[model samples]
Target chain A: SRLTAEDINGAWTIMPTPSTPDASDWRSTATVDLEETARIVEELIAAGVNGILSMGTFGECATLTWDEKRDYVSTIVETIRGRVPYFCGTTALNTREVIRQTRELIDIGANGTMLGVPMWVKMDLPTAVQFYRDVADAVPEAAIAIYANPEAFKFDFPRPFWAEMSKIPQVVTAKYLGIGMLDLDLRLAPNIRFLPHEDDYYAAARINPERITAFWSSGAMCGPATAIMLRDEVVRAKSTGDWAKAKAISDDMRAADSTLFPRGDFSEFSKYNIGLEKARMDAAGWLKAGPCRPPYNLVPEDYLAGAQKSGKAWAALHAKYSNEL
Target chain B: SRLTAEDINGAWTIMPTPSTPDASDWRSTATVDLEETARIVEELIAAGVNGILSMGTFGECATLTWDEKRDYVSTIVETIRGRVPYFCGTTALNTREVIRQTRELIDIGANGTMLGVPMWVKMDLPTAVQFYRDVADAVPEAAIAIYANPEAFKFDFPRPFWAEMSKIPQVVTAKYLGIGMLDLDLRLAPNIRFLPHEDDYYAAARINPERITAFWSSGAMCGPATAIMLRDEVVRAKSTGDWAKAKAISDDMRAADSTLFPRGDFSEFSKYNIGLEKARMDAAGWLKAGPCRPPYNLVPEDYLAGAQKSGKAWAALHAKYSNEL
Candidate 1:
């Protein structure tokens, strides 16, 4: 794989793993339909995601069993086949389990590991620093991204924790919460790439052009058309000194988030109920999104109705932005 | 044990369980010092908290072993000795485990179980409604409060879930995040008390004086001095129908939070690193703050410096608001 931080310096999307049965049993046993998983991964690559991630919090990584996770990661890795950088979320509450599973993902041919702390317990700097160091040491081959979504994990990476993580050779991206960027001291680990959230990317790029060359596109749930448009604007912002187009794109992303997500809280709505996103995607004729696994899309029936509404809304937005992709 | 929703209509505090260097391993194993735990319970009661909750998120319920949690609950129960309505958090990722623990705590003499969805798995409305109903049926004696911290749980109770839970006789309070209030249609469960976060209480009360009469205080982290003052204002506002005082107190809280917490993101900071809160408490000479159990407070050295600074900063804020308490 020729992918590096620079290569991922655009809109990277996390693929929501498609499951069969369309029911809410994702709590304990996660059985992914490999064919469906492959279809979406291929769709995302074709749709123009700069890189692809699997088994993230939104991907229902927390509910997956070890074999289930391996099966999914392997399927995505094989399907992506180095078309883009392939990252798999292998984070868990236990450290040894993270190391073990991380090594397993590496063995399965995942290009990188996107890690979030075992959120159930709060870890101090020393413990967190050691945890990342230990994880990187265990799988020195795969590049690492710290999943710092404030909506998901208890601790997003703090300054000193990031400093310590930067020293590790395999550390590549800080999949940042918008807030951590305000607290982080980038000089401590200048080599590490900072990936801001989609709505926040242009602002971050405008603030410190050196730090944020890349961003995450969780908004692909609306459809890839708008996301790719935004990514192109971000790229344009980077290449040219003028950021007016990027800022407009950022505003557009936020506007879309307002319609696509509940209360304009993108991460929360997406993570807590991937079903709504699936519902929208299915409604948009992207694919037949079956029910999201349990503990997700655990929304009321009315919420599903609202999701269906958003599906039509996003399809209209996609049509408007279709030419950009 | 005859606690009801009406009884908890004021500020309630969740006490962080103090520990001794009983052992080095903090992962999955917790050893609580009953004497220390009792002292803090007494202190919170003295500070004028209308109610007390033990073994909550701040109480490190996720990290504690079942036996350790029982020991702490029992100690706090005996210490309170019916002095205040004592609630104990008994949420777990597994439904059967939550049911088992809720029953065990009822036997141990907790007045109410402050429950949240199993944070590890996201449960939908039907599943959540069923989960709470099952627990209530299992422990018919204890009242229940859904600990719906958006920052903590993957799925806190939405309005529909709360509506279903309210049908259960044991369901009493919605330990709410501010966002949930916007989504909640209170008409569905008029009997269920909406317990907003301490910071957001005044606004919640202002929005619907008929519904949100009480609230929760995790600010017991900084010290109960400020929490007690705020609670007094809430009581005064409720009794006198004069919200001017309550709004002032809320402003004071915001000011205190800005100084005491990192980035003024109280829930995000405190939930992740209860150690910083613990460290601040220790420095303020409030409690002999012990190390928070792992996966939390894994802060680096600088964060400790920040915690120390905030500890002194909080003392200054307390002196200014000292007269109200």
Candidate 2:
């Protein structure tokens, strides 16, 4: 029912909604047919994503209205059926709306909600602190993950702000990407957790093993075997006191990133290019999640071919790595 | 009058505007008083940046209207008066408008322009390709720099797009921050210049020397002495084949980035936290640019103190490095 420490320390996958047709259709976002959405959940769970997350930038949260957003969340949560840990993105333009949505999502079956830096307007300290403070006050039961996605949010949640956030009980994890993770303030972080990307997870763990336990992968479309493999390496190394094995596996993850995310790690292509994720997943016998919607409608053949080339390659790579794990 | 290979090879600083009073004024962006702006330019030139890049994300190009942007470009050109290489940002919502602005900036005596990913809407590959191609055709005489600022632009332009851009003679440099610079394709980059930041420059240059000749820094707000010092190391590295020395200097630049930019690099703080940059410059006996505009209004004492602490540290660091270089 709530996010436990064990749940926080493994790969939490944010699910991208699949459409009956594709994002190009006017009804793709609004339609919210649960069967395909359920299929995405089933496959990711089968691939071993630790937790199911929804409505993130990859899910095209920006495109959907609030009502449709709630429906999307409900469908994803219902499909997961409490089989695993679950959460949904509940970020909004202002503080009050995000707080309200956080509570709403929790009420509708999500364990918590992921919040990003507000869109459009950039934040200075006071506003940034207040935004988190107000949200923390509004939802005590909602376990919050602060998404430090500079590309999607147009800003970063400065490390010092995280220090402030550590004091608030509802603020649990930092879904981080920047340099803040290089040196975290341990005094304030006993209860506060850092959900870094794999790279950050490696670096931060080198400094303080106990402080940061896991990371939130944007989507599992690259498949989850390699991620679980990396996680097991860390687990095995930590259990046996062999840090070198941990680092070696971490380095391999770095190599896999280039082939799998040929666009870039969490780069816009990886974030908004669902068609690429879908194609790779489909080739691997995972469920399909059609192409990207308008504005990001699939690029012409040459470009899509470039992505497809990588997609098919990742699919094959996923099989190689998945079997090895 | 045109930008050359050397002009693109070193530290090309994107200048932040000297606003009137502060952005709190109803007409802050429109009210540009160039006396102080010119002084900042003179001081930076004295500190020795290789080129002046303006109207960029750091230049507050989004805040100003078309006419004000033209005036800002014209004023910077007049002040420089051919003293060094100068390029002004000329990004627009649409390709045709960018072409128009590119031509107009050139007419106003700008040597070239820095174009970022189109704002608001993300561009598909074909559309992104066409956007630059149209601008390249329209401004045949104006040297072009593609600004791959993911935060401000809301899109990560994939490496494939850069391959197409390389064909256009006008598209000469890539002002990059992400993975494009990490492992550049030599096949696509003989003509195109690579302007990675100090960090990217270090990583890319290790693989291939000629393929990556330069890097981009947002503002010399950290002060230009250190920038020039790093440039000297690169110069020294090239002449003597001492990559270790080059990386040592580049790593120091990365270390100072935290001090100079206490918040986050290229995060909203770097984009809008001019107060912090100004405070550092002021300590170095540089002229003052007033506080940030609305939405990016100044934070309370605690936050400003965090920046001031870093500013003072960088000032001392700049002095120590200046003497060493």
Candidate 3:
């Protein structure tokens, strides 16, 4: 098979390596104080998670130059502590930049990668196919996850494009982000594993775990935060065929997401990623992931207190799901 | 049944009669020169239409004074020569105007009236029902066709409302325009006559022809211009009740309309209707009928010449659907 459906699953994706903008304004740029990142990575690994997606929109991949992206990639790779896999956020506005990141990330040991295509220019099928091939050539053996976004400059290919493209080798997975699911199923069915992102990941898994194996939910660390706990169970369920725990975990994850950011504007309305992430982790208790870096806007006293409040609820949610783990 | 699914066959919603900043532009006012209107009436009627909807956006109803809409309703009534029924575009920005228009149109011999709910205020269903009932009281003899425009303004009423409103004697028809047909049938499949404007009318007919009987075709006067041309045979072949003829007539008109003033330019487009109608009439051998009034722009040299040349095709096309009458 040129592309196997199951091959793209489970690898945690990281932000693409950026040499420039890698060490500046950590919060917004997501270069996050390096020491803190290492600590978080250690914590995440301790929780028995094996993947990290660095430098994504959550990581703030845009506005970073080639050098910054490369440096960022190098840093994430360095910090991951290697118990698990690492995939870089190879997504970019310019295909040139995406391809460049792809090449650089491979050189620096990103196990696989995901690339949300250049939204500015929507490529017809051939162009998109070429886009994939170009990225694939950079890291011939490295898994290439197509980051499918429907609203990306209105250049969405029908899902059949996915089914067809899924047949290509090295195109291991696709991080699907589209509005509706029924249409997606009709067009790209019969399963190569597809992970749909956006906060509704776990609920979707409960509905169709056969087709969807993962999600690319990132908005301040660990959203649908229930998934971080479920991720371990899912991988176990996949190998052991233990469905009960995965389904229960998925439902709890969905519940966790619904409780906090169901409205989708936490970071903007709240102070910063640290409070949001820490709030999620403190609530979950599996990872004591600490504060995020500069430019995240200080957590207002009131917001911090609210986060502390939410942390209790999230902790309960995390505990419920952790029972499955 | 007060109204059948057939009452809403197809509507060629004349765009709100285009308006001008200058009230005197004559064209802007709802008044159509009798001669011009007569030809338009004959063109549409001869095409086998069940009725004429007068003084809409196509008639520039917004620009028309109560007197103008009244006069315009009379013009269509007088012009159509009893070949088909006629409805008044009675929509207004508020309940008071809607009532006023209702009474005025009824006084003018309009068999029915149409109205788009005001989008700005977003009147609740109770208010909307009251608005209709109040107008019904003013013009008890006239049928009221509620106009639901999903796009221009967004007063999306659930179906229960239309179902409830249909309990009234006068609210017999509904003009469901835009924002997709799925919306209309799913929510509005209750007791009223649901006719669609333009393209989505075709969709409604396909999805639930049982619920839809009326049709509106744009661009041509030859026939129903829809599936009327193609699948009529298959429908006839099956001999088990089909709307094939209706579809053909709608499609024919749609095809005809697309060919004429296909890319209708607003400022320059007004001329197309006047001249196209004349040619359409002449082609149907009705030139001896008459021409339009001062405010209505007569066909310019180029279009007049083209119409003269296109006469035979127009007449031949109409002759094909003559049996419709």
Candidate 4:
């Protein structure tokens, strides 16, 4: 069936296609392999990432060609099958292409897709309605989500318009990281939704854990860098509405930037996801998140040095909260 | 007597505040004393600022209260005393306030205010019609230079919309940034006059130089930074069409950005703006563009270092270029 609102809620890290990332073109290659996907899914579960969302901003989808995308997602679908709520990114600039891709994703047995818009065609309200209807009609069994990423873009219409436009049934949920959730509350939101993906997640969760805490608990939002910022106890305490624990988790997350290493843009994030995920699967913690293929470069040396330092620092911070998972 | 089409075409920067220091909780404290008013004006002249534009972005008009604005422009009037084109920044939050500010600017001997609608308010056509009408009526002697700053914002309306809107008498010249000039080439462009602003002067000149170039060459686009970006080739290339030289100046202007050190959200553009102008001044062996007071921090350290490195690099890049003003 179509992606419902309940799918993307809570802890999901809205991502992009790992191979065809558009925003950051720092690298022109990928080294991580397809089967490494199993390690990533399993490790994210270990890291307590309830779900893993692939083909989002960090995964960079716009640059992906159709064949390139299908091949990559095929591997991911095989690796993540029945393991978790493995959502595939389903967004595209062309509705026809989006539909075609949706058909392929369903063929690959992906749980869902995160579809964006026909911005190229300047899809207005009625057109957006028809576009989603067509998409849902095409893949009635597969789940689909809406990635309305706000912060990363400068040259587009404001999101209030999108909230109005995404009122269709298949448009089950939305991802917002623009201003604040208060603006979001006023917008009649869809059934499924995600917290803004990056730096704000912990703080936003601490403030409104009801909407988000449920998702984290449900194994919907999963990524490698979990309570990487949260103290284990604080994460555990989230069930008890312990403000102090939440504050501690948030503070540690803030410190994670400076402690684990210097603050960096999303490139380090790509490396981190790959590195931590692969390392987690080692029979003896020896296998690196090896290169999957060309196009996704493994993290660079300087970046890994910093990430290693940051990772150790994160370990220390989490250790302070709890040694147990 | 508003700023004409010629007033904002080329290089422009505001004369620093002429008021004496005052103590306040905000940054309104610690400003230029009127004692140096003559010296600042003389420096602007020596730096070859073509026209006199006061209360501009460089002037920190956001901090000015209504009365302070009145006082500031009045002092500017007393100093410039119609010595050159005494254009003023016509930024205000609302039409009523803009009308009041326009009258005040003219009353204080401003030639005209360079006006723009506060995009944060989302003023549409009728509101805009009311805006220009009231401001024009209030300062009938004030000619208007219509400005469309694309870097500042985007209005969803099409070029035809702007073309139709240009019918007002006060709208003698249009200051178009990136989009404005494109509109000129794409549309029949309203018969009403227009002036293109500092953002992309060279392209604007190329598009409708007969309409925009004359004003640009006349020093309407007054600013140290713009002139630096123009790199004297704009000044030299007018009759000769030596694009090579204009390109040289444009390169130097980019080098100036190293000094400005823009970071985060692009909204902090004004922060680096002073440094950009200052970088040019530095190249010209003028005052080391000190910080423009707080709220706008001094160019960050990386910027300062990069400015040093890039300035020399740009110099090297343009070493083989034109030497004429």
Who wins the DockQ comparison?
Answer: 1
Model 1, docking class: incorrect
lDDT of 4: 0.50
Q: Each candidate's DockQ score against the native complex? A: 0.11, 0.03, 0.03, 0.02
Interface RMSD of each: 4.8, 8.5, 10.5, 18.4
Q: Which ten residues in a row are the worst by lDDT in model 2 chain A?
A: A179-188
Tens-digit lDDT track of model 1 for B1-325: 4667777666687777787674224333555878888888877777777888766665777656667788888888888888888888887654545666788888888888888775554455676776677677667898988777655665556667767777887888867766445435577777788777788877877778777777787666567677677667766787889889778778877665565556666553644456676777777666775776544546555566677776766666667676655
Question: Which regions of candidate 3 deviate over 4 angstroms?
Answer: A1-95, A101-325, B1-6, B10-31, B78-83, B118-141, B149-173, B179-185, B221-325
Q: Write down the lDDT that model 1 would get.
A: 0.70
Model 4: fnat (fraction of native contacts)? 0.00
lDDT (Cα, tens digit) per residue for candidate 1, span A144-210: 9888764556455677777787788788887776644453557777667887777787778777876
- Candidate 4 C-alpha lDDT tens digits along B1-325: 3444434444454454443434123556445454455566665666565555555454556555666566666666786666666667777777777777787777778777766666676766566656667777676788776555434423433343465455555665554443322422233344444443343455444433444442322111123444544635555665674566564454444333333334322345544654444343344332333344444445666555544554444444333232332
Q: Give TM-scores of the second chain, every candidate.
A: 0.88, 0.86, 0.64, 0.70
Look at candidate 4 and tell me the lDDT of residue A58: 43
Q: Of the pair 2 and 4, which is ahead by lDDT? A: 2
lDDT, each prediction: 0.70, 0.66, 0.53, 0.50
Query: Compared with the true structure, what per-residue lDDT tens digits does model 4 show for residues A45-124?
Result: 56655456666644545445566667667776676666566667767767777888887887887777766666545655
- Candidate 2 is graded, for docking, as incorrect
Tens digit of per-residue lDDT, candidate 3, span B47-105: 45566665544344554566655555667778765666677787778778777767766
User: Which of 1 and 4 is ahead in lDDT?
Assistant: 1
